[PDB]
Symmetry: none
Subunit: 25 residues, 3 copies
């Protein structure tokens, strides 16, 4: 028999890094 179909998508990736600091007051 032929191979089965592809598996499901993997899970959602991790959050990105924080943004840079805000502007001086």
């Amino acid at each position: 028999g032929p191979p089965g179909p592809p598996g499901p998508p993997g899970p959602v990736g991790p959050p990105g890094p924080p943004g840079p600091p805000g502007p001086p007051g």
Copy 2:
């Protein structure tokens, strides 16, 4: 007789950076 579905793929990549912080 087809095989079963494959395994789940890899975790996605890290998200993009957040926005700049608040003014001081």
Copy 3:
């Protein structure tokens, strides 16, 4: 007998954006 399992699926969605940065200096 059956075939072998299929290949892995694709990678998942990109992760969410990070949080806002820290405050600026006073």
